[PDB]
Design a protein around this nucleic acid. Structure first.
Length: 56
DNA sequence: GCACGTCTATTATCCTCAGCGCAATCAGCTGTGACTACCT
């Protein structure tokens, strides 16, 4: 989050492209033979694309 | 910058199987009338 700001376009800060990182869901970790520890707060919250969420 | 045509999607609902008791079905017997042939 402390990445240097290259500039401002119409008030919006422009960041470097090589700063994008991804994560995985609990089901994805399960496929990777890993189990999420109980009580852990999820690190990132994003709008999911699952059919159950899509119907909701 | 805005609206239209197009490509694609991280778990739900609906037509068909399984032992007993009641009703449907046939076999056998009889009635009712006539038809018909042989013998006394």
């Amino acid at each position: 989050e402390t990445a240097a700001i290259l500039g401002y376009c119409r008030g919006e800060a422009v960041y470097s492209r090589d700063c994008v990182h991804t994560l995985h869901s609990r089901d994805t970790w399960l496929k990777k033979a890993r189990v999420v520890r109980l009580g852990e707060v999820p690190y990132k919250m994003v709008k999911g694309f699952s059919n159950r969420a899509r119907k909701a």
